Amino acid sequence: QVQLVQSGSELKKPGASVKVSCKASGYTLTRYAMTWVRQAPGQGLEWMGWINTYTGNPTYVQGFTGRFVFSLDTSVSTAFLHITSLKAEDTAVYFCAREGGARGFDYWGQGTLVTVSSASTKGPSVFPLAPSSKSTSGGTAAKGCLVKDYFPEPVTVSWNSGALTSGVHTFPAVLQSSGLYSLSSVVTVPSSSLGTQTYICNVNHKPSNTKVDKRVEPKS
Amino acid sequence: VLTQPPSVSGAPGQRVTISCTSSNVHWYQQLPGTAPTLLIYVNSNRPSGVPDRFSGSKSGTSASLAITGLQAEDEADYYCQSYGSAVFGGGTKLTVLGQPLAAPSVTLFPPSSEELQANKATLVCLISDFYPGAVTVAWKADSSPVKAGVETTTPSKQSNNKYAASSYLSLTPEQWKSHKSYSCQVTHEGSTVEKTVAPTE
């Protein structure tokens, strides 16, 4: 069956270079034209141009006629997008698509996130959000973990090694102006459980290779 | 390069239409966080896996995409693309006009002593269960507005199809201990909720 599969996410710093791959299968690469599309966060689809899988002579949109390069490897049956001298404005998802010629753009790659940031990889600073019954009803306390300043995404958060699920709410992370990510996860538990019951915040950050288990005690 | 309405709305069961208006069609649907998918090709036609609700229209001055009997899963972004290179139609967000308004639940957490010990401080305002997804967050130090050191998320859908948001006010322990109290003020559909904390606590 027809398929386009691209590389995984890429974290780069400004000035660096990146190679994104587009593996086509299920059809013959040389018979259809491969086009490149760009989509920055919260934006529309930018057509970048296309490569001639027949010849291999690429054609770029103006402004992409710069440090962007389209390359081809018909042996492996793969199309490559090269970006040199990366900049913050290059932070975007990049798609490869096939031109059936009446159909589109009928097939797309899943998309490749290129993230360009001056921020170095950083492990989270985890702090305990102690129980507060003010915003919670039913004789119930809300507690949590504040995950401060980590880069890049994602971060995983569980409670009591996963034994606690119901009443949990992990809020999406904010991107501050740093840049760095801050996230906060709250669990809602019975008032009587405290302080007889133990509640631990399991925070996991693969990019930093960091893990933190933080006990959340009631108060002073 | 092309032109479409930035926004369109309809209630489930209704019929919505997206307009697309010399030098220059195919239509693409895009769910959040996923790649675009071929919706219409040849201007009248759909591939296999496209419902009968979607109908494309060519008029020769312009093109149109009509969805009849709108559904919940149709809430997404829709793109128009004609040709001579490939021209893209720009973004159009389609939001289903179902469900009633929901009042936000606001929970405010003060800085922990461990953070204060670490020569840092953060006020955490967590906002849940509100619809629609429009809220404004204002921070106050002793009834005086603060905007420096504020970081707020763009609201996002929860599991129950309501919206959540979270605001953070970063501080120095000095600033924290200085004032008598800090307030997080969330405004939603002409209604306000102000949560407050104090260093004394």
Short mmCIF file of all heavy atoms in Angstrom, two decimals, chain A residues 46-77:
data_model
loop_
_atom_site.label_atom_id
_atom_site.label_comp_id
_atom_site.label_asym_id
_atom_site.label_seq_id
_atom_site.Cartn_x
_atom_site.Cartn_y
_atom_site.Cartn_z
N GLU A 46 2.46 26.36 4.01
CA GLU A 46 3.33 27.02 3.04
C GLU A 46 3.90 26.01 2.05
O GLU A 46 4.60 25.08 2.44
CB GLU A 46 4.49 27.73 3.74
CG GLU A 46 4.09 28.90 4.62
CD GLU A 46 5.30 29.65 5.15
OE1 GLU A 46 5.79 29.29 6.24
OE2 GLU A 46 5.75 30.60 4.48
N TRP A 47 3.59 26.20 0.77
CA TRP A 47 4.19 25.38 -0.27
C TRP A 47 5.63 25.83 -0.51
O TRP A 47 5.88 27.00 -0.80
CB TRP A 47 3.37 25.46 -1.56
CG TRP A 47 3.78 24.47 -2.60
CD1 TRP A 47 3.66 23.11 -2.54
CD2 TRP A 47 4.38 24.76 -3.87
NE1 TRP A 47 4.15 22.54 -3.69
CE2 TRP A 47 4.59 23.53 -4.52
CE3 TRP A 47 4.75 25.94 -4.52
CZ2 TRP A 47 5.16 23.45 -5.79
CZ3 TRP A 47 5.32 25.86 -5.78
CH2 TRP A 47 5.52 24.62 -6.40
N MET A 48 6.57 24.90 -0.37
CA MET A 48 7.99 25.23 -0.46
C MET A 48 8.54 25.04 -1.87
O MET A 48 9.50 25.71 -2.26
CB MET A 48 8.79 24.37 0.52
CG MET A 48 8.39 24.54 1.97
SD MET A 48 9.22 23.37 3.06
CE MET A 48 10.94 23.84 2.82
N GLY A 49 7.93 24.12 -2.61
CA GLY A 49 8.40 23.77 -3.94
C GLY A 49 8.43 22.27 -4.11
O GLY A 49 7.85 21.54 -3.29
N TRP A 50 9.11 21.79 -5.14
CA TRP A 50 9.10 20.36 -5.44
C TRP A 50 10.37 19.88 -6.13
O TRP A 50 11.08 20.65 -6.77
CB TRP A 50 7.88 20.00 -6.30
CG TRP A 50 7.76 20.75 -7.59
CD1 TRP A 50 7.11 21.93 -7.80
CD2 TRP A 50 8.28 20.36 -8.87
NE1 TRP A 50 7.20 22.30 -9.12
CE2 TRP A 50 7.91 21.35 -9.80
CE3 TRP A 50 9.02 19.26 -9.32
CZ2 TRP A 50 8.26 21.29 -11.15
CZ3 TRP A 50 9.37 19.20 -10.66
CH2 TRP A 50 8.99 20.20 -11.56
N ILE A 51 10.63 18.59 -5.97
CA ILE A 51 11.80 17.96 -6.56
C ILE A 51 11.34 17.03 -7.69
O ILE A 51 10.30 16.39 -7.59
CB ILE A 51 12.61 17.16 -5.51
CG1 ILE A 51 14.09 17.12 -5.87
CG2 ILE A 51 12.03 15.76 -5.32
CD1 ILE A 51 14.42 16.24 -7.05
N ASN A 52 12.11 16.99 -8.77
CA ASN A 52 11.79 16.14 -9.90
C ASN A 52 12.37 14.74 -9.72
O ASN A 52 13.54 14.51 -10.00
CB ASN A 52 12.30 16.76 -11.20
CG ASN A 52 11.44 16.41 -12.39
OD1 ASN A 52 10.55 17.16 -12.77
ND2 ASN A 52 11.72 15.26 -13.00
N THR A 53 11.55 13.81 -9.24
CA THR A 53 12.01 12.45 -8.96
C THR A 53 12.52 11.74 -10.22
O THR A 53 13.18 10.71 -10.14
CB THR A 53 10.90 11.61 -8.32
OG1 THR A 53 9.70 11.72 -9.10
CG2 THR A 53 10.62 12.09 -6.91
N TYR A 54 12.21 12.32 -11.38
CA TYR A 54 12.68 11.81 -12.66
C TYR A 54 14.15 12.17 -12.86
O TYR A 54 15.03 11.30 -12.86
CB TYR A 54 11.83 12.38 -13.80
CG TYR A 54 12.22 11.93 -15.19
CD1 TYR A 54 12.80 10.69 -15.41
CD2 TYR A 54 12.01 12.77 -16.28
CE1 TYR A 54 13.15 10.29 -16.69
CE2 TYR A 54 12.36 12.38 -17.55
CZ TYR A 54 12.93 11.14 -17.76
OH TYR A 54 13.28 10.75 -19.03
N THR A 55 14.41 13.46 -13.02
CA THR A 55 15.76 14.00 -13.11
C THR A 55 16.40 14.06 -11.73
O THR A 55 17.45 13.46 -11.49
CB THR A 55 15.78 15.40 -13.75
OG1 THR A 55 14.82 16.24 -13.10
CG2 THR A 55 15.45 15.31 -15.23
N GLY A 56 15.75 14.78 -10.82
CA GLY A 56 16.32 15.08 -9.52
C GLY A 56 16.65 16.55 -9.40
O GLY A 56 17.17 17.01 -8.38
N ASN A 57 16.35 17.30 -10.46
CA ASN A 57 16.47 18.75 -10.42
C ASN A 57 15.34 19.37 -9.62
O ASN A 57 14.17 19.26 -9.99
CB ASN A 57 16.49 19.33 -11.84
CG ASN A 57 16.53 20.85 -11.85
OD1 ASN A 57 17.58 21.45 -11.62
ND2 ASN A 57 15.38 21.47 -12.10
N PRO A 58 15.68 20.03 -8.50
CA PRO A 58 14.71 20.63 -7.59
C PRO A 58 14.26 22.02 -8.04
O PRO A 58 15.01 22.73 -8.71
CB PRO A 58 15.49 20.72 -6.28
CG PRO A 58 16.89 20.98 -6.73
CD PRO A 58 17.07 20.22 -8.03
N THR A 59 13.04 22.39 -7.69
CA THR A 59 12.56 23.74 -7.92
C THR A 59 11.94 24.31 -6.65
O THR A 59 11.02 23.72 -6.06
CB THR A 59 11.54 23.80 -9.07
OG1 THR A 59 11.00 25.13 -9.15
CG2 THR A 59 10.42 22.82 -8.83
N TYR A 60 12.48 25.45 -6.23
CA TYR A 60 12.12 26.08 -4.96
C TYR A 60 11.23 27.29 -5.16
O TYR A 60 11.28 27.95 -6.20
CB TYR A 60 13.38 26.50 -4.20
CG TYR A 60 14.47 25.45 -4.12
CD1 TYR A 60 15.50 25.43 -5.05
CD2 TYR A 60 14.46 24.49 -3.12
CE1 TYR A 60 16.50 24.47 -4.98
CE2 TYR A 60 15.45 23.53 -3.05
CZ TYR A 60 16.47 23.52 -3.98
OH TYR A 60 17.46 22.56 -3.91
N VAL A 61 10.42 27.58 -4.15
CA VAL A 61 9.72 28.85 -4.08
C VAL A 61 10.73 29.92 -3.67
O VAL A 61 11.69 29.63 -2.96
CB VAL A 61 8.55 28.81 -3.08
CG1 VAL A 61 7.95 30.19 -2.90
CG2 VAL A 61 7.50 27.81 -3.54
N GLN A 62 10.51 31.15 -4.13
CA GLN A 62 11.41 32.26 -3.81
C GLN A 62 11.51 32.46 -2.30
O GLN A 62 10.50 32.49 -1.60
CB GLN A 62 10.95 33.54 -4.49
CG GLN A 62 10.92 33.45 -6.01
CD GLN A 62 10.41 34.73 -6.65
OE1 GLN A 62 10.31 35.77 -6.00
NE2 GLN A 62 10.10 34.65 -7.94
N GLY A 63 12.73 32.60 -1.81
CA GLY A 63 12.99 32.69 -0.38
C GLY A 63 13.34 31.33 0.19
O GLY A 63 14.00 31.22 1.22
N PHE A 64 12.88 30.28 -0.49
CA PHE A 64 13.32 28.92 -0.20
C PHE A 64 14.41 28.52 -1.19
O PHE A 64 14.92 27.40 -1.16
CB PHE A 64 12.15 27.94 -0.28
CG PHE A 64 11.09 28.17 0.77
CD1 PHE A 64 9.91 28.82 0.45
CD2 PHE A 64 11.28 27.73 2.07
CE1 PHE A 64 8.94 29.03 1.41
CE2 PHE A 64 10.31 27.94 3.03
CZ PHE A 64 9.14 28.59 2.70
N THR A 65 14.76 29.47 -2.05
CA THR A 65 15.83 29.30 -3.03
C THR A 65 17.14 29.58 -2.33
O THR A 65 18.21 29.60 -2.95
CB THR A 65 15.66 30.25 -4.23
OG1 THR A 65 16.88 30.30 -4.98
CG2 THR A 65 15.33 31.66 -3.75
N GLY A 66 17.04 29.81 -1.03
CA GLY A 66 18.20 30.03 -0.19
C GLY A 66 18.68 28.72 0.41
O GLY A 66 18.61 27.67 -0.22
N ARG A 67 19.17 28.81 1.64
CA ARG A 67 19.75 27.68 2.37
C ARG A 67 18.92 26.38 2.44
O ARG A 67 19.32 25.44 3.12
CB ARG A 67 20.08 28.13 3.80
CG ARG A 67 19.00 29.00 4.43
CD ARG A 67 19.31 29.36 5.87
NE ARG A 67 18.09 29.30 6.68
CZ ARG A 67 17.08 30.15 6.55
NH1 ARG A 67 17.13 31.12 5.65
NH2 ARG A 67 16.01 30.03 7.32
N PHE A 68 17.79 26.30 1.74
CA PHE A 68 17.03 25.05 1.64
C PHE A 68 17.47 24.24 0.42
O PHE A 68 17.64 24.80 -0.66
CB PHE A 68 15.52 25.32 1.57
CG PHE A 68 14.95 25.95 2.81
CD1 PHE A 68 15.27 27.26 3.13
CD2 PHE A 68 14.11 25.24 3.64
CE1 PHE A 68 14.74 27.85 4.27
CE2 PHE A 68 13.58 25.83 4.78
CZ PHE A 68 13.90 27.13 5.09
N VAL A 69 17.65 22.93 0.59
CA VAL A 69 18.04 22.06 -0.52
C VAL A 69 17.21 20.78 -0.56
O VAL A 69 17.03 20.12 0.46
CB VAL A 69 19.54 21.68 -0.43
CG1 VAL A 69 19.90 20.59 -1.45
CG2 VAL A 69 20.40 22.91 -0.66
N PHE A 70 16.70 20.43 -1.74
CA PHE A 70 16.00 19.17 -1.93
C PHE A 70 16.94 18.17 -2.58
O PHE A 70 17.52 18.45 -3.63
CB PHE A 70 14.75 19.34 -2.80
CG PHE A 70 13.80 20.40 -2.32
CD1 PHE A 70 12.81 20.89 -3.17
CD2 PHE A 70 13.88 20.91 -1.04
CE1 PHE A 70 11.93 21.86 -2.74
CE2 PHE A 70 13.00 21.88 -0.61
CZ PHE A 70 12.02 22.36 -1.46
N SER A 71 17.11 17.01 -1.95
CA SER A 71 17.95 15.95 -2.51
C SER A 71 17.14 14.67 -2.66
O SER A 71 16.04 14.55 -2.11
CB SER A 71 19.18 15.71 -1.63
OG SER A 71 19.09 14.48 -0.95
N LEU A 72 17.69 13.72 -3.41
CA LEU A 72 16.95 12.52 -3.78
C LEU A 72 17.83 11.28 -3.73
O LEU A 72 18.99 11.31 -4.14
CB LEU A 72 16.36 12.69 -5.18
CG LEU A 72 15.19 11.80 -5.57
CD1 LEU A 72 13.96 12.11 -4.72
CD2 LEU A 72 14.87 11.98 -7.05
N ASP A 73 17.27 10.19 -3.22
CA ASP A 73 17.95 8.89 -3.22
C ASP A 73 16.98 7.81 -3.68
O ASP A 73 16.27 7.21 -2.87
CB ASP A 73 18.50 8.58 -1.83
CG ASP A 73 19.35 7.32 -1.81
OD1 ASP A 73 19.69 6.81 -2.89
OD2 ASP A 73 19.67 6.84 -0.70
N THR A 74 16.95 7.58 -4.99
CA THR A 74 16.01 6.63 -5.58
C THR A 74 16.38 5.19 -5.25
O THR A 74 15.53 4.30 -5.30
CB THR A 74 15.96 6.80 -7.11
OG1 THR A 74 17.28 6.72 -7.65
CG2 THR A 74 15.33 8.13 -7.48
N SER A 75 17.64 4.97 -4.91
CA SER A 75 18.10 3.64 -4.50
C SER A 75 17.35 3.17 -3.27
O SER A 75 16.79 2.07 -3.24
CB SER A 75 19.61 3.66 -4.22
OG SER A 75 20.32 4.21 -5.31
N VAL A 76 17.34 4.02 -2.25
CA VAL A 76 16.62 3.75 -1.01
C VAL A 76 15.15 4.16 -1.16
O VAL A 76 14.32 3.86 -0.31
CB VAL A 76 17.28 4.51 0.18
CG1 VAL A 76 16.56 4.25 1.50
CG2 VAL A 76 18.74 4.12 0.29
N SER A 77 14.84 4.83 -2.27
CA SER A 77 13.50 5.37 -2.53
C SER A 77 13.13 6.39 -1.46
O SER A 77 12.15 6.22 -0.73
CB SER A 77 12.46 4.24 -2.58
OG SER A 77 11.19 4.75 -2.92
#
